[PDB]
Amino acid sequence: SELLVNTKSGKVMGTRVPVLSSHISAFLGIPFAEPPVGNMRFRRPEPKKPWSGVWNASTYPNNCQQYVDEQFPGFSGSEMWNPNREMSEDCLYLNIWVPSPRPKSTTVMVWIYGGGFYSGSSTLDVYNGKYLAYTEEVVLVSLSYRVGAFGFLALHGSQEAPGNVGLLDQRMALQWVHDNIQFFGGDPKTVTIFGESAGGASVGMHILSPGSRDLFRRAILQSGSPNCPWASVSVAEGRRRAVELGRNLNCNLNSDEELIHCLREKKPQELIDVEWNVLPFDSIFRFSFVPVIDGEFFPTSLESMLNSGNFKKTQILLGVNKDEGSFFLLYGAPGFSKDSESKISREDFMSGVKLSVPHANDLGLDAVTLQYTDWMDDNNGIKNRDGLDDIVGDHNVICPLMHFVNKYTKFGNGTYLYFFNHRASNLVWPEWMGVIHGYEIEFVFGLPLVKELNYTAEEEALSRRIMHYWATFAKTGNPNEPHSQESKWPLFTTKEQKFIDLNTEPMKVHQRLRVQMCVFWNQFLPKLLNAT
Amino acid sequence: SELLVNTKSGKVMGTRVPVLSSHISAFLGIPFAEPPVGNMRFRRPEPKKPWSGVWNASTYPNNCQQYVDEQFPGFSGSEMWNPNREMSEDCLYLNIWVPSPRPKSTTVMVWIYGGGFYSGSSTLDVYNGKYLAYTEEVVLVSLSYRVGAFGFLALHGSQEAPGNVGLLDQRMALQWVHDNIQFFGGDPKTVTIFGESAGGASVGMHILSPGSRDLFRRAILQSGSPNCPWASVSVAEGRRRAVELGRNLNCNLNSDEELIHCLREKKPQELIDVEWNVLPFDSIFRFSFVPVIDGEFFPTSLESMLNSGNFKKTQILLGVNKDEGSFFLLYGAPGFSKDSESKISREDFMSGVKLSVPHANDLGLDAVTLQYTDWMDDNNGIKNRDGLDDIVGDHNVICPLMHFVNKYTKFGNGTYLYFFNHRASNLVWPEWMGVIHGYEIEFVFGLPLVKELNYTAEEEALSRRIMHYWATFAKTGNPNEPHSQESKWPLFTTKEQKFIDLNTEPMKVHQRLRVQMCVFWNQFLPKLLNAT
Ligand SMILES: ON/C=C1\N=CCN1CCCCCCCN1CC=N/C1=C\NO
Ligand SMILES: ON/C=C1\N=CCN1CCCCCCCN1CC=N/C1=C\NO
Ligand SMILES: *[C@@H]1O[C@H](CO)[C@@H](O)[C@H](O)[C@H]1NC(C)=O
Ligand SMILES: *[C@@H]1O[C@H](CO)[C@@H](O)[C@H](O)[C@H]1NC(C)=O
Ligand SMILES: *[C@@H]1O[C@H](CO)[C@@H](O)[C@H](O)[C@H]1NC(C)=O
Ligand SMILES: *[C@@H]1O[C@H](CO)[C@@H](O)[C@H](O)[C@H]1NC(C)=O
């Protein structure tokens, strides 16, 4: 049977799914780990014990325990990111979309979801791999991983909660793909890992971590990189935040054993309710429980690893969206609202920059403000709003990514860079937010091919281009067709630093993506803060 | 007789001079001070003892002892600024141009020459007051003052060389104008002092100094203001430089009396030869012997005086030239030449900024470099050259002036601001230097009215406009004609901050002159250097 696959962990029974007037195979909710419940909470993931009989893989699994967005109840813009399945600590499963008829050995793509390491699901509508699997004839896998304290609580030295276990969740799924994707018609030596935001940073972290490298071939990073200021913390800071989480739940704080025991006793939602109380500063774009620089998963500091070329040498395809910051300002910055144009005054701009550059002293805050203020028109609401949008985007996503790409390209075997700046016609968020964080995903997963979702014809065409770029790159290391008549996406080089726009218009090549601002964020401001 | 004038100091005999196919009176080389020779060197100026008989005032006096530019021998561009008369320590004289027939009581304008407090002459061709006196029917006076160590050697505490004596030279000439200009047909209650660069700073210093205020009515400041970083030094720094000058001339340095005695023994040219050896840094736009903040001429620091409104409240007309920095880069910065386009490399740009911001630490130098570099096109020779030109101009002339004007306008009784950006058609300096420091003077003194000097018709028209602005302002406090059909030069206000361009084109009003860069030089960089 086509829906019956025998793996090293046991037999699995899939389901046949309709896709654009055709059909493909779907293997949903396959376990790759033992349930991390009870005393296994905060622990490293253990491999799933093989099962006798046939595993029912016809429906989506549970989503991992996480915070749920309730800011705009009923609004699709915010609820498209919320878990669409029952939540449970028993959530370590993966999903596989397989073309019909089954391939022998074809390109594999593995999706790692974002959500600031505090949220996310593999089961989201925008992550439905059936369109990409069908159109580009790839085997598409979406993994899951523990988020929040459950996945990233870090008490370094302790073996019961060492930190980074969410990253190890991903690794074990990559291990399972390596070991078992052959039986689904996938090529284990041609696996691309790709992810957005926290997933993009995760991808970059698997490039860096020695234990992770051999488990994939190539990498795609969307709106995230490992060196993002929100993507990791020191062991001390991780320790501090875990102790503080215990303080919020009336735990015995005399030792790690006392603390971990207390936290393992608390219901999932008790941890989630007080999670955000441990952040050290009044901030936006910062998350409580994230990867730690532990000396194991990351041997040394990320920067020293990047400088010495201590990482996997392969091809990477990466890029950013035009307005990465808007989503975070709306949710956490004064003066921003969903139903207004959110024209920001100087006072709110100044509040914004503070929230937005938490680790800065007064001189640092003055430097940022000077860098992003038109002092000829400083009371312009639009300019203050867009300037603040640029600050959050540049500091958190673009400039960290630009530093990663420049460092990686020294030692790597091919880099391709994009700038996604098409604003979707059918998008429910207000105009001022622009090309929002995470809204290239729908084009990557081919949602514009579905008429019911109300995209334009040119948006369908863009989606097909992007999908073909992603899948051709996954196959070859090059998003371009070999001898094709279409305009070529040029290689990113240390010298020329070329990149393309990604929109409905004819391709344009530019150079030095946001270099003026990123020299500020990567070279000048760090020098300023270190001196003062 | 029209050329015979009886003053409080004695009788004076002038000369009749041809001016644009007409004639006016000229009283040249009138003494207002006792010769500051011998033991009077470095001393405060004493008033000229009245004389019996008739003083011969038909020829220009001696110029004060100063450095002579020999970089381009024969070249008019550099030698138009050199002394055109025999040099002598006996140089404290003034020159008066009087309309014919003699006026009863008319507007007086008093010119104070520039030259970095180390050079300058009242007798220069570009300072010939006959054109302005004739065309606008004003009494034009040009004073002289001691420059270099002779005028500004400062050993605070000592009464033999107290410092600021060059400023007091100017004051005593203003005193003489106050007391005697009535006999030449000038109105002593309608005297405007005006000057360029060091003369512009001097004018601003007479606005600040309590001892100077009552001696004039209104003020015009050209390409200079009192708060310029090159325009003054502390008492300690002045003391340090005077001791170091003695060290260069093998002086006994055991006391001020020993030092001053030694320096008074040295021939004038011996002081001039080693003058530039006392500068503390490797720099451009810095001069050895300048005004000191002494507690007398300036009661407190200039900034605190400006903030508390401790200055003369009257009308001011002031402004800057487009390319103030070029003259200084040519003479002192690597990569700049008179006979090439002077395209500057990154290495020479970086050398430039160092020379150019002497009192800055490494973080400060990085801030300036970031502020003026297009990081998309950083190897552009033209952009590096023009950027450096802007750095020198902004830091030394425009931003200091913009800080002065903004502070003054709070308490003043009317401000008028200009931006002179017309490049003369007949100008001998290379193209890259643009609208050079000091090259509005010729338009102010009406040289384009003389056909032999080869200006265009539109340059003659501009000159007549500028002269009429200057003279109407001197007369009324307003450069505009009351009920005139010509477009109005708007008042500079704290709120609107309006200014005009000054060129051959129809008048354009702008706002906030170079505010982006001047917020950097006046607000941010000072905060940076004070922290580090
Ligand atoms: O414990 N975990 C989380 C929380 N705890 C208390 C409050 N809450 C904070 C969530 C705010 C994080 C900013 C996220 C807003 N934008 C940006 C990208 N996606 C966003 C919405 N997606 O629905
Ligand atoms: O002792 N006094 C002076 C000196 N001693 C040694 C050398 N020399 C330094 C003179 C350089 C000052 C820069 C001036 C160049 N530009 C700018 C404006 N005018 C200029 C030229 N005018 O001819
Ligand atoms: C697998 O699960 C679905 C829904 O829970 C059920 O309808 C279907 O019959 C199942 N198929 C099996 C066990 O073969
Ligand atoms: C990638 O590596 C191959 C084989 O080692 C080499 O021949 C090729 O030039 C490399 N490509 C790039 C872009 O570095
Ligand atoms: C004043 O000086 C000039 C030149 O030195 C001389 O020719 C002229 O005769 C003098 N006039 C007098 C003293 O009346
Ligand atoms: C100048 O002062 C006069 C008289 O004190 C006053 O009436 C006038 O408004 C002032 N003008 C300005 C521009 O401040």
Q: Ligand 6 mean position to B413 CA, how many Å?
A: 5
Q: From residue B424, how far is each of B185, B221, B506 by CA, in Å?
A: 35, 21, 17
Least Cα distance to B406 among B529, B511, B489, B507 occurs for B511
Amino acid at A224: G
**DSSP codes joined into one string, A117-176:** TT---S--GGG-THHHHHHHT-EEEE-----HHHHH-B-TT-SSSBS-HHHHHHHHHHHH
Half-sphere exposure of A133 (CA within 13 A, CB side): 33
Euclidean distance between CA atoms A402 and A394, whole angstroms: 10
Q: Which domains does chain A have, with CATH numbers?
A: 1-532 (3.40.50.1820)
**Active site residue: A324, A440, A442, A460, which one?**
A324
Classify residue A359 as exposed, middle or buried by CB count within 10 Å of its CB (0-12, 13-18, 19+). exposed
Query: Quick one: CA torsion of B142, B145, B147, B151, rounded to 10 degrees?
Result: -170
Least Cα distance to B341 among B326, B352, B351 occurs for B326
Amino acid at B132: L
**Which residues does chain A have within 8 Å of residue B512's beta carbon, measured at their own beta carbons?**
375-376
| B221-245: burial string, b at 16+ Cβ within 10 Å, e else | bbbbbbbbbbbbbebebbbebbebb
- Cβ atoms of residues B344 and B381 within 8 Å: yes
* Residues A289, A293, A299: CA angle, nearest 5 degrees: 150
Helix/strand/coil (H/E/C) assignment for every residue in B291-337? CECCCCCCCCCHHHHHHHCCCCCCCEEEEEECECCHHHHHHHCCCCC
First to last CA, chain B: 68
Euclidean distance between CA atoms A119 and A125, whole angstroms: 15
DSSP H or E stretch at residue B56: strand B54-56
Euclidean distance between CA atoms A140 and A207, whole angstroms: 20
- Cβ atoms of residues A509 and A417 within 8 Å: no
Per the entry, the structure determination technique was: X-ray
Partners of B154 in beta bridges: B162
* Residues A342, A346, A352: CA angle, nearest 5 degrees: 65
Does the annotation mark A324 as catalytic? yes
- Cβ atoms of residues B518 and B403 within 8 Å: yes
**Least CB-CB distance to B528: which of A363, A374, A511?**
A363
Query: Parallel, antiparallel, or unpaired for β B10-13 and B54-56?
Result: parallel
Q: Tokens 């990465």: give the residue.
A: A324
Q: From residue A119, how far is each of A114, A276, A395, B175, B456 by CA, in Å?
A: 7, 13, 22, 81, 73
- Cβ atoms of residues A164 and A294 within 8 Å: yes
- Cβ atoms of residues A108 and A185 within 8 Å: no
Q: Ligand 2 mean position to B168 CA, how many Å?
A: 23
Does the annotation mark B324 as catalytic? yes
- Cβ atoms of residues B32 and B173 within 8 Å: yes
Contacts of A224 (CB under 8 A, 6+ apart): A114, A195, A196, A197, A198, A199, A200, A201, A202, A203, A204, A231, A397, A401
Does the annotation mark B206 as catalytic? no
Contacts of B249 (CB under 8 A, 6+ apart): B262, B263, B266, B270, B271, B274
Euclidean distance between CA atoms A243 and A253, whole angstroms: 7
Q: From residue A440, how far is each of A201, A320, A448, B348, B489 by CA, in Å?
A: 16, 9, 11, 44, 53
Amino acid at A8: K
Peptide bond before A358: cis, by omega within 30 degrees of 0? no
Output DSSP code: residue B68.
Answer: -
Among protein residues, the one with the nearest Cα to ligand 5's atom 13 is B56
Ligand 5 neighbourhood includes B60 CB (under 6 angstroms): no
Which long-range contacts link A293-300 to residues 24+ away (Cβ below 8 Å)?
A293/A232, A293/A233, A293/A234, A293/A235, A294/A154, A294/A156, A294/A162, A294/A163, A294/A164, A294/A235, A295/A235, A296/A162, A296/A164, A297/A164, A297/A167, A297/A168, A297/A205, A297/A209, A297/A211, A298/A205, A298/A208, A298/A209, A298/A232, A299/A210
Euclidean distance between CA atoms B329 and B380, whole angstroms: 18
Euclidean distance between CA atoms B206 and B220, whole angstroms: 12
Ligand 4 neighbourhood includes A413 CB (under 6 angstroms): yes
**Which residues does chain A have within 8 Å of residue B516's beta carbon, measured at their own beta carbons?**
374-376
Output DSSP code: residue B24.
Answer: E
Chain centre distance of CA A333: 22
Q: From residue A516, how far is each of A475, A512, B371, B374 by CA, in Å?
A: 35, 9, 10, 7
Query: Parallel, antiparallel, or unpaired for β B139-142 and B186-196?
Result: unpaired
**Active site residue: B197, B209, B212, B342, which one?**
B197
Q: Ligand 4 mean position to A206 CA, how many Å?
A: 21
Ligand 5 neighbourhood includes B59 CB (under 6 angstroms): yes
**Which residues does chain B have within 8 Å of residue A512's beta carbon, measured at their own beta carbons?**
375-376
The sign of the torsion formed by the CA atoms of A145, A150, A155, A161 equals negative
- Cβ atoms of residues A177 and A204 within 8 Å: no
Q: Ligand 6 pocket: which of B217, B413, B415, B417 to mutate (most atoms <8 Å of CB)?
A: B413
Å between A348 CA and nearest CA of chain B? 20
Residue B300's CB is within 10 A of a number of other CB atoms, namely 13
Q: From residue A334, how far is each of A69, A383, A388 by CA, in Å?
A: 19, 16, 12
From the CA of A416, which ligand is nearest?
4
Q: From residue B363, how far is each of A369, A529, B357, B387, B512 by CA, in Å?
A: 18, 10, 12, 19, 28
Q: Ligand 1 pocket: which of A69, A70, A241 to mutate (most atoms <8 Å of CB)?
A: A69
- Cβ atoms of residues A188 and A178 within 8 Å: yes
- Chain A positions touching chain B (beta carbons under 8 Å): 363, 366-367, 370, 374-376, 511-512, 515-516, 519-520, 523-524, 527-528, 531-532
- Cβ atoms of residues B240 and B206 within 8 Å: no
Residue B76's CB is within 10 A of a number of other CB atoms, namely 12
Written as six digits, the tokens of A355 are 């929230």
Q: Ligand 3 mean position to A56 CA, how many Å?
A: 7
Among protein residues, the one with the nearest Cα to ligand 3's atom 1 is A56
Written as six digits, the tokens of A7 are 């793996």
DSSP H or E stretch at residue A511: strand A509-511
Q: From residue A128, how far is each of A28, A372, A465 by CA, in Å?
A: 11, 39, 18
Euclidean distance between CA atoms B224 and B113, whole angstroms: 11
Peptide bond before B99: cis, by omega within 30 degrees of 0? no
Chain centre distance of CA B121: 11
**Which residues does chain B have within 8 Å of residue A516's beta carbon, measured at their own beta carbons?**
374-376
**Which residues does chain A have within 8 Å of residue B528's beta carbon, measured at their own beta carbons?**
363, 528
- The verdict on a CB contact (< 8 Å) between A528 and B528 is yes
Q: Tokens 């709106």: give the residue.
A: A223
| A280-296: burial string, b at 16+ Cβ within 10 Å, e else | eeebbbbbbbbbbbbee
Q: Tokens 């206000």: give the residue.
A: B493
Query: Parallel, antiparallel, or unpaired for β B509-511 and B498-502?
Result: antiparallel
Among protein residues, the one with the nearest Cα to ligand 6's atom 1 is B413
Partners of A524 in beta bridges: none
First to last CA, chain A: 68
Ligand 2 neighbourhood includes B152 CB (under 6 angstroms): no
The sign of the torsion formed by the CA atoms of A356, A360, A364, A365 equals positive
- Crossing angle of helices B165-180 and B198-208, in 10° steps, is 70
Classify residue A495 as exposed, middle or buried by CB count within 10 Å of its CB (0-12, 13-18, 19+). exposed
Alpha helices in B62-147 (DSSP H): 76-79, 130-136
Ligand 1 neighbourhood includes A81 CB (under 6 angstroms): yes
Least Cα distance to A341 among A392, A384, A391 occurs for A384
Partners of A111 in beta bridges: A142, A194
